[PDB]
């Protein structure tokens, strides 16, 4: 069972608290959603402390379709409508400071441009190679997605409410499952937690955000 | 100089002919565009012979933003308008036969669904995790992009005019340059060629497609 495999990381409240602390230290975490949903684990990083080396690891070890989780307000500031009349907006590229936009450094530059609380729509070309996602108001208490988990995690840690995610992928191209996620987290010193963990945590610590 | 580094692979005409033969054998090739353009090398595969293991290699070794190069006609058949009023359409997912769409197998399933000459728009959900690109009519003699190179390569090899591409990426997240591309091609037995090679080839062999 998954709850028994995660015991190693502590009880649910500890798993949340350890994840929040890692984010405050500028490290990444591994977030699993429900087993009966996608049953996938994403690498999560805070935008505020995002480095080229973190982005390189995400590209190397995950699907490479690296997403920027934004508040509805920030996506509205950037004039990012849904890509289609998972809440993908149109993809984005920094208008300045990048070349082709695909390199790890370029993606970070685009992400920081987009997440800047003083950003303007002209700051971003469209389309590009970073994929923004709109988190639902209410976070994981409204939608149990990694998108909401990501932004909720940043808010609960006291950070700017923007993060990046990408799905952990096995070398043979299949999606990592809990055993593989646990091993990856130990290898890279990243705490593991679930959306369930965050839901119980927010409810019991009566935590509106 | 790049032309001297590629000499190992044969003269320009040989580099084209070797690439075409690899595609007919169901193997991949490495296509470089102009040094003063993106100066990037993409892994290219024919859709017709695409395997999960080929897709896994692309995700592992490239940006992970794996693109499906289509004729304008095929994109029109699928009712794929531009993602924005590089010719990205809206992203796509197979409507059937996939789970979350990100796994190597799922991407291949989506690609084969989209490239089927009998496909219908209802076959594809939007958005998704495969990114189609419209090749310009005229191919590399109209636009010197990897998008056109990909589709031109399939036509010249006598294959269905659909291929996939993705940008070769170094482990540190920078984009591979010619030395690294050459080494990768030797390691994985993939021929290397340039868009320039294909332009001279099409012009001299007076090759409309
Ligand atoms: O497919 C995607 C992003 O490409 C999303 O589904 C992410 O995989 C996680 O997003 P959630 O749906 O869990 O919020
Ligand atoms: O950025 C992209 C795809 O994400 C494209 O630019 C590809 O990198 C190659 O396409 P071309 O512009 O060379 O046709
Ligand atoms: Mn997810
Ligand atoms: Mn390119």
Please provide residue A78's backbone torsions phi and psi, each rounded to the nearest 5 degrees. -85, 0
- Which residues in chain B precede a discontinuity of more than 2.5 Å between C and N? 85
Indicate the DSSP class of residue A11: S
What does the domain layout of chain A look like in residue ranges? 1-209
CB atoms < 10 A from the CB of A11, how many?
Answer: 12
Q: For residues A60 and A54, what is the distance between their CA atoms, to the nearest angstrom? A: 10
Question: Distance, in angstroms, between A22 CA and closest chain B CA?
Answer: 23
Q: Does A64 touch chain B (CB under 8 A)?
A: yes
Q: Does B100 touch chain A (CB under 8 A)?
A: yes
Cβ A95 vs Cβ A123: under 8 Å: yes
Q: Does A188 touch chain B (CB under 8 A)?
A: no
Strand B124-134 versus strand B92-94 pairing type: antiparallel
Cβ B30 vs Cβ B184: under 8 Å: yes
Cβ B185 vs Cβ B61: under 8 Å: no
Q: Answer positive or negative: Cα dihedral of A46, A48, A51, A55.
A: positive
> Residue B86 is encoded by which pair of tokens?
């590089």
Ligand 1 atom closest to Cα of A37? 13
- Closest alpha carbon to A155 in A47, A53, A65, A55: A47
**In sequence order, what E strands does B74-184 have?**
92-94, 124-134, 163-167
Indicate the DSSP class of residue B28: -
Strand B124-134 versus strand B67-70 pairing type: parallel
**In sequence order, what E strands does A13-172 have?**
29-32, 41-46, 67-70, 92-94, 124-134, 163-167
Query: CA A123 → CA A74, A92, A93, distances in Å?
Result: 13, 10, 9
In the sheet with A41-46, reading across from the earlier edge strand, the strands are: A92-94, A124-134, A67-70, A163-167, A41-46, A29-32, A192-194
**Chain B residues close to A101, C-beta within 8 Å:** none
Indicate the DSSP class of residue B30: E
- Across the interface, of B60, B172, B174, the residue whose CB is closest to A171 is B60
Exposed, middle or buried by CB within 10 Å (0-12, 13-18, 19+), for A130?
A: buried
Q: For residues A172 and B171, what is the distance between their CA atoms, to the nearest angstrom? A: 17
- Closest alpha carbon to A44 in A19, A65, A21: A19
Experiment type: X-ray
- Across the interface, of A66, A83, A173, the residue whose CB is closest to B103 is A173
DSSP H or E segment with residue A46: strand A41-46
Sole residue written with tokens 């799905």: A167
Cβ B79 vs Cβ B121: under 8 Å: yes
Angle at B27 between CA B23 and CA B31, to 5 degrees: 70
Q: For residues B196 and B143, what is the distance between their CA atoms, to the nearest angstrom? A: 11
Which chain A residue has its CA at the smallest distance from B55's CA? A173
Hey, is A84 helix, strand or coil?
Answer: coil
DSSP H or E segment with residue B155: helix B146-156
CB proximity list for B62: less than 8 A, separation 6 or greater: A64, B42, B43, B166, B167, B168, B169
Q: Long-range contacts made by residues A180-183, C-beta under 8 angstroms, separation at least 24?
A: A181/A30, A181/A32, A181/A41, A182/A5, A182/A6, A182/A8, A182/A9
**Chain A residues close to B52, C-beta within 8 Å:** 172-173
Q: For residues A162 and A108, what is the distance between their CA atoms, to the nearest angstrom? A: 13
Strand A41-46 versus strand A163-167 pairing type: antiparallel
**Could you give the count of Cα atoms lying within 13 Å of A136 in the half-sphere of its Cβ?**
13
> Residue B18 is encoded by which pair of tokens?
């070797």
Q: Does B160 touch chain A (CB under 8 A)?
A: no
Q: For residues B108 and B151, what is the distance between their CA atoms, to the nearest angstrom? A: 17
The resolution, in Å, is 2.0
Question: Distance, in angstroms, between A130 CA and closest chain B CA?
Answer: 10
Q: For residues B195 and B145, what is the distance between their CA atoms, to the nearest angstrom? A: 7
Hey, is B51 helix, strand or coil?
Answer: coil
Beta bridge partners of A32: A41, A194
Sole residue written with tokens 């409240």: A13
The response to whether A144 counts as a known ligand-binding position is: yes
Closest ligand to C-alpha of residue B93 is: 1
Angle at B5 between CA B4 and CA B8, to 5 degrees: 95
Sole residue written with tokens 């069972």: A1
Cβ B151 vs Cβ B137: under 8 Å: no
Q: Select the residue from A65, A83, A166 to test the B interface by mutation, using most B Cβ atoms within 10 A.
A: A65
> Residue B124 is encoded by which pair of tokens?
């594809």
For A13: left if phi > 0, alpha if psi spans -120 to 50, otherwise beta; the answer is: alpha
Query: CA A209 → CA A151, A205, B94, distances in Å?
Result: 10, 11, 36
Cβ B104 vs Cβ A102: under 8 Å: no
Beta bridge partners of A92: A130
CB proximity list for B111: less than 8 A, separation 6 or greater: B47, B50, B68, B130, B162, B164
């Amino acid at each position: 069972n998954q709850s028994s495999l995660l015991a190693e990381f502590g009880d649910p409240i500890t798993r949340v608290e350890n994840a929040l602390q890692a984010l405050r230290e500028g490290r990444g975490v591994l977030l699993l959603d429900d087993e009966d949903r996608e049953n996938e684990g994403d690498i999560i990083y805070a935008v505020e402390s995002l480095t080229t080396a973190q982005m390189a690891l995400m590209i190397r070890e995950c699907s490479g379709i690296v997403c920027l989780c934004l508040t509805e307000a920030q996506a509205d500031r950037l004039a990012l409508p849904p890509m289609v009349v998972t809440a993908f907006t149109v993809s984005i590229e920094a208008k300045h400071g990048v070349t082709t936009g695909v390199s790890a450094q370029d993606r970070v530059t685009t992400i920081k441009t987009a997440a800047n609380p003083q950003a303007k729509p002209e700051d971003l070309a469209r389309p590009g190679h970073v994929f923004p996602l709109r988190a639902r108001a209410g976070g994981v208490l409204a939608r149990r997605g990694h998108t909401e988990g990501t932004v909720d995690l940043m808010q609960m840690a006291g950070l700017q409410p923007a993060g990046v995610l990408c799905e952990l992928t096995n070398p043979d191209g299949s999606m990592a499952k809990t055993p593989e996620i646990i091993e990856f987290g130990k290898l890279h010193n990243m705490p593991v937690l679930t959306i369930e963990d965050m839901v119980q945590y927010r409810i019991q610590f009566d935590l509106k955000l």
